[PDB]
Amino acid sequence: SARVSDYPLANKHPEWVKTATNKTLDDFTLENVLSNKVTAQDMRITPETLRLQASIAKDAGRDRLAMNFERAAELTAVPDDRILEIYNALRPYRSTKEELLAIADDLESRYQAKICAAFVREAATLYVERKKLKGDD
Amino acid sequence: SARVSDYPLANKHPEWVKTATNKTLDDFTLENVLSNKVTAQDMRITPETLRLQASIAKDAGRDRLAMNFERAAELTAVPDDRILEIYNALRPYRSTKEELLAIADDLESRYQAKICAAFVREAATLYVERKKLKGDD
Amino acid sequence: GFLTEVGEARQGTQQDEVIIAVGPAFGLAQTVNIVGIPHKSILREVIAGIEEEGIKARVIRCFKSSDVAFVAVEGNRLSGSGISIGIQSKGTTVIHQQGLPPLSNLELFPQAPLLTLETYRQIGKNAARYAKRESPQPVPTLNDQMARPKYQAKSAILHIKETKYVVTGKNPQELRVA
Amino acid sequence: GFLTEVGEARQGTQQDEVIIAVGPAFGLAQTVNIVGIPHKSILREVIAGIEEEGIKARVIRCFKSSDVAFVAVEGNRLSGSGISIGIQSKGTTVIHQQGLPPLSNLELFPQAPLLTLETYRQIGKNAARYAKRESPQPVPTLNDQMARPKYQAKSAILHIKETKYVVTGKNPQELRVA
Amino acid sequence: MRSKRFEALAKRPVNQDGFVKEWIEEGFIAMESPNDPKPSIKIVNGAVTELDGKPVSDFDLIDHFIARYGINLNRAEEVMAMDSVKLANMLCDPNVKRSEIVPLTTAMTPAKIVEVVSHMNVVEMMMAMQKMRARRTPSQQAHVTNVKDNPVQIAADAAEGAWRGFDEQETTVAVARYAPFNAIALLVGSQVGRPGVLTQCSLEEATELKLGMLGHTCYAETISVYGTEPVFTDGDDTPWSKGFLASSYASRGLKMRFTSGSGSEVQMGYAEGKSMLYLEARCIYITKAAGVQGLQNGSVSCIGVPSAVPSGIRAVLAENLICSSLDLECASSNDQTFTHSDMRRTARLLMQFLPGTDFISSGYSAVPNYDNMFAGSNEDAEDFDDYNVIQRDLKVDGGLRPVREEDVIAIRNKAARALQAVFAGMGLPPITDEEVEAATYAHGSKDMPERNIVEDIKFAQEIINKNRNGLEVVKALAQGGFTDVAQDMLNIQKAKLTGDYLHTSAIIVGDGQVLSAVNDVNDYAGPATGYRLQGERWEEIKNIPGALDPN
Amino acid sequence: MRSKRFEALAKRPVNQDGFVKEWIEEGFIAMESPNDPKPSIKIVNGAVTELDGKPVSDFDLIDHFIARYGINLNRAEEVMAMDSVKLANMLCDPNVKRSEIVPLTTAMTPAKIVEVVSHMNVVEMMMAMQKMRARRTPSQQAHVTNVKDNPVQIAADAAEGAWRGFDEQETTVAVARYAPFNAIALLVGSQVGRPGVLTQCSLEEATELKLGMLGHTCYAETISVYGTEPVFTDGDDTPWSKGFLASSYASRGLKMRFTSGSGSEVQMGYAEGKSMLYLEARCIYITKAAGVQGLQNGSVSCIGVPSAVPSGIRAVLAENLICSSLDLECASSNDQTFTHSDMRRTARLLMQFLPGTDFISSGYSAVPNYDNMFAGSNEDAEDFDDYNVIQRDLKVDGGLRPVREEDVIAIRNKAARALQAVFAGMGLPPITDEEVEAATYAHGSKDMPERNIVEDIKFAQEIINKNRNGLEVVKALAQGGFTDVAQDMLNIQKAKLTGDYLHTSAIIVGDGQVLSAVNDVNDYAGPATGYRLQGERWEEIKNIPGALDPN
Ligand code: COY
Ligand code: COY
Ligand SMILES: [K+]
Ligand SMILES: [K+]
Ligand SMILES: [K+]
Ligand SMILES: [K+]
């Protein structure tokens, strides 16, 4: 697993950051950009990279930071508009409990976002108790 | 031998401090000032008081401060105008060596100020070496 | 006084009325804004602004939050036009609209000490332009680097006091005239 | 070049002159004061102030120290009237008197940037009036809290440079003024 | 009769400031309040059952979040049982290493660490801060705004700030619908001034995330958290929605930090009778719990609240120290006006400037304050010379440097030109050459030709409406002949791909070299150790304008 | 075309200050010069044969004085062998006791202790200073002067300054022959404000001693020493004339300290190629060697010299730290103008204000700077409210407090009335009721009627030539309706009989109680120990004007 000794990846192991697309950092050129050899998705960070960074975080003694990065790796699978939907659904008084549980089941089943699904499920029962659901205002 | 446990003298041992002319601290009242029962000539710190303070300074870990107090104790015997004469004599280019040595002899034989006499003979010797005697400018 | 709750406020009909949503202490425990401009005069110019543009001006007192955005939001739900103006007792003001998240808005006036009666009328005016889906050019930006130094602590104390009149879950009240 | 050294200055014999004593770089390596007033003009006005009062002005250059008190003391030693004016290249001026300790004086001008050509003449006038045993009222105080902020570093640099021309034990030179 | 002494005193700027006597019950007290809870914790089977007096049955959303994720439970009882006075001593002791303290402070409850730092005077706090700061090298962040949202000015100002040394720069909007313009302007110009400078555009949360998705920013900071549940709620979030947002930014490769700061809960009406410092500590632990690397705090926008009460400016340094003691990056405010007095605002800044923080200010205004759209910063462009002079005076690296008028003029000029090309290729409302020369020589928006708000805002809103992304900026740069800038722009996105700058305190310096707490390890152990201003950087700092060469 | 940004900067007050590139060969460098000597000592049969480079054959009077009396020769070799970095670490380590350090520092050579403090940053130096300060309780000293030598005004300004909190106050002259009036006016006004405040009148050395011999002063401070022999010579003294003078003051029971300060030797033309800090260290050891208890330093009147070069204000803090570290009272300057910038002078003052020193300033101007006869202080009367606000903001005891206009008016009035009675009783040129009223309500000499300086100077002269002493002032007060004040004057005269206030850092507080380092031992050991602002004093500091009660 990635260690502090492996950081920065860019300097020590740039070939580790090869996109899921399977093209390196060095591929990201103005010319390639111009010729459309590289395009907007091409510069999407990968879950692989975020898991690398999560391990370094851990190695660095920062477990919560690592955890954040693990959620992040999961969330790379969720489309931008869907990200915004779920963020907004977590804001006070936006959702019913069942609506939140549906979001969590979705994260788990469609995107295998296991950790994020548990996070949302957690939110759902505590929003019940602390009365931050739709109609609690 | 006074120690820091004996300080302040005014609180700890006011008696130890009895002036020039046997007046006590408590003899210095408005009433006695006004009747001239006490005057400026009575209001003078004694060599004994200063040597007590020198012991306290030493006990406080300040040997050079004590030595200053020991020199001051000697100088309480020297009249104000003579003090000013000797200070000015020590300023650069004021004195010849022989004049400094005579201030030194006079300190010792007239006032028993042996430390200050030693101090002045020391300056005479070094004033020759560093050329700060009359005529050396 | 000048404000009369005339029962729980009902959903608006016509898309050409602007609600002024007022904090739970406006014109009651507090009667003037952070710099002394009275509540009546402030309601005065806001209303006049809307009316003169040919739109109805409705006023309600907000209860479920003293936050200016949430009370504007309360009003935009009921405004037949979907346009509302939220106002705190200290004077802070916001023009809101249905479909916007509460911390978004059409126009914000986030330094109350800089507002004037003329500013309050332009706000009403603009609210009405928006209600006609007119797209008014925005009220000119007011800003002063020393506003917070001089007034933020007082703003705080005034907000603490108004906030004591918040009632969770309680629905806005409709209010009658001067 | 407006100052010529004409030999070792001798002691004055009558109470009829004021010595102007200048530092060892005055009119030489330095030729204006800290705020650019020409040494030529300074010397002109002080001499005129003295002569104005019917007293002789006699100019010497001092070498044994560049300090303006010691400069002026060299001059008071030689002055027929016991009165002298010490002037450094940077402009600092002092009126001194035979009998006074080096660091005591009759009047001091310790903020050279504030001096004007009018001050220098007034200074000469006062010097003469001392010479004549009148009791002139002192030249009015010039003070400014920002003089050191603006000028002390420059004053230090000009003093460092003049000080290079100090010569221990070299007696003052009488000067001819062009 | 009036004393003329008091009449003179009455006129001084400082007496225009807002001052208040403490109001304990409404939490209008900066720190050391008798209502703050006694530190405590109970753990059963690895879960918190008691937190600072409160039973888990009574936990609000903030208690749950901190209890479940914000505290090092492995050493929490250990540290709870240690004397708070000893712990404070350890904090400022040069011979107790940062790596020995972090396991303990991160195990402290919010009330515990508040209790620890409250034993300290500001000299002790500063002594501690220089050790606890996560990045060995101190940095600086600027505001780049103007009251017009004029994009060519922002670009020029951005470029000048980067050149003066800011490693992060922040813009925001006078009129919110202008935002995409501001963002692109800031990015372009920042890259012109120094490639690697990070940029953000501060907006409402959902709006800002979307601009980041579109690639018009490189990080986000004003991701707000609050220290009481009613205030958080008025902030329209919970710890879980802000935690989700945090991870959302990271999932797009964007560095982010939260923002908090003493006084927000008072200002917003619900202090729950606690001191600003104690509520701020809760905010810092919320940040920690969320897995967020860093935090903007030190009252920030609420600075008129703690500054009004006694020991408020000491509480602000204390909240910055708690932040760094928790192993979080600290962007330490010094970015918002609280006083009319130069003396007073200088005393407030030196608390962070002297020891150094990850970002000494989290928004030095790089424009005159009339143009500052955060309602004024504690420093602005007119203070740049003073700031450099004080660096030189104290041999303190405050992250900035003296610059040459000719270089700044050049630099602002290529930035104005570049943004001009960009609007060109993108077919945005044109930036005339008039505008370019004006932004070149401007001090502020008073020196800029008015623009058509209508034509910019229309095109601005369309950039987001139609999801126009960063690539468009890059192409336009290339098309207009700014390949360098376009490359540099590409290089930012590249960093985004590697994830290295997601770590604690990361900035990007030199030839795209990340510099974070991970590879720029703060190793302070007293005099002559840790970061020391010296060598070429000291020479650079010594070279202020007007230094006359004596010879 | 010009940059409008640079045009605005060019107008800033800081760009009016004098700045200079280092001039190493001439010593125009604040500290850490390549020409400063490597620390070294050699001792043979109890006598030093080499000191910091120099062989005894080349010693000047300063080397001789220091080598013979300024260093604890019994431990000098031991301490020289210790690592300067560890010693610097000891200085700021809160757990290394002051009493464990003083035996080491007083055995260091001047170069050695400079080498030690030069490893430190200003945060470390402040951390050290709070510990090394001799008196546990920090204090403050003010100037009381006016450009007219108006004695009524000086008494009133002195009463106000004593009331505000100064424990020592200092006058000097516009016109030197006025000196005895100034001195008496200062003493009277000071005892009216707070019985116990000590007063001095700074003059030529012989003239000042004589004034003291006549009983019109409580102490002397501007007893100058210098760090090169040629400069000392132009200062019209030697180490031996100045040590004799020191002992002469003590032989009259008068408290005294020396004065030095970085940059004097540069200013006076002979730095012998050395840095300002190294030469100031020689001054500090001259002071120690003479057996003088305390020192006024921190550049003092030459502040424009170190401030002009890099790290000059850091050097100033360093010289203060060397002073305290060598177990001398430090009256730490902050008493002289060096800048047009409020920002810059605030940073310079906080170096001493935040840690606390024996006298945070040795001459805060208790008059508006136009009236300051030391050519301007770093703070003046118009800064009083700012000073109190910063105390409150940071919880720092700066020695001063907020005060009520009506108290100040009553106290200024009483001071003027007492002095009026003094002049009448002693047959001096009258003080009129009109002058009493003006002095009562004045801000400075602009508010005062002009006096006949011919008459004043004649009678002031006669005080000296007819040796009119301090008991004449006591009788006139007693005879003129001011028995309380007369008693207080008598009491401060009686302090001259005990020797108690001759000790390190002595001031006189409460009911004539001496407060010195001997009975007010600084016992700092980190957070929650040592002197702490708290209790009633904290309440007093919190109570600034304009602080509205929220409810
Ligand atoms: C102080 C301030 C606050 C603080 C107090 C708010 C409050 N509700 O009490 C603070 C920091 C908590 C805060 C939060 C927000 C949140 C909204 C929260 C809320 N419910 O109000 C916010 C949505 C940010 C977010 N990330 O969520 C928000 C924003 C975007 C803005 C902008 C609104 C733009 C718009 N909508 O058109 C804004 C104009 C800045 C800008 N240039 O973009 C500004 C008004 C921005 C202001 C800049 C500006 N141009 O004015 C600024 C800097 C100064 C205003 C002032 O002091 N006026 C003087 C005072 C005496 O007059 P007043 O009328 O009483 O002022 C009130 C209004 O400004 C009002 N108010 C303030 N912001 C705001 C926003 C909205 C939508 C509404 C309806 C009302 C709002 O609050 C004050 C006091 O009651 C300010 N804020 Co806020 C600035 C946020 C900055 C980053 C986060 N941040 C900074 N410090 C800290 C902290 N310690 N803790 C946590 N977060 C932060 N803000 N703010 N804010
Ligand atoms: C800076 C200064 C000095 C320093 C520089 C002196 C020098 N020769 O280079 C300093 C600290 C060494 C110094 C010493 C003394 C010694 C004289 C030494 C000497 N050979 O000149 C002194 C006798 C004190 C003593 N205990 O011995 C002395 C006195 C009394 C005075 C007063 C003269 C009264 C008078 N005679 O009518 C005075 C007016 C103050 C006062 N109100 O009493 C002032 C001029 C008092 C001034 C206050 C004022 N009202 O002006 C003040 C504060 C500002 C002057 C200035 O910056 N002008 C701006 C500059 C751009 O203009 P300039 O023309 O180039 O200025 C020059 C002259 O002022 C000249 N000069 C300065 N003092 C002085 C005195 C005499 C008699 C003469 C002829 C010329 C003098 O030096 C400067 C630089 O070249 C000043 N000084 Co001196 C005040 C000393 C205060 C306590 C000691 N002290 C403070 N800091 C330190 C330190 N770092 N080390 C050691 N000691 C001290 N001084 N000073 N000084
Ligand atoms: K907070
Ligand atoms: K910021
Ligand atoms: K010195
Ligand atoms: K002083």
Side-chain angles (χ1 to χ4, degrees), chain F residues 141-143 168 170 200 202 219 221-222 257 259 296 300 331 333 335 361-364 374:
Chain F
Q141 173 206 117
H143 297 152
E168 288 187 359
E170 173 175 23
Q200 55 163 319
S202 302
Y219 76 115
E221 159 181 80
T222 56
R257 70 176 61 99
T259 295
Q296 174 175 229
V300 191
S333 194
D335 57 340
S361 91
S362 52
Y364 183 124
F374 297 100

Side-chain angles (χ1 to χ4, degrees), chain E residues 141 143 170 200 221 296 335 362-363:
Chain E
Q141 172 200 118
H143 292 158
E170 173 177 29
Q200 55 163 319
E221 165 182 75
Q296 170 173 234
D335 53 343
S362 63

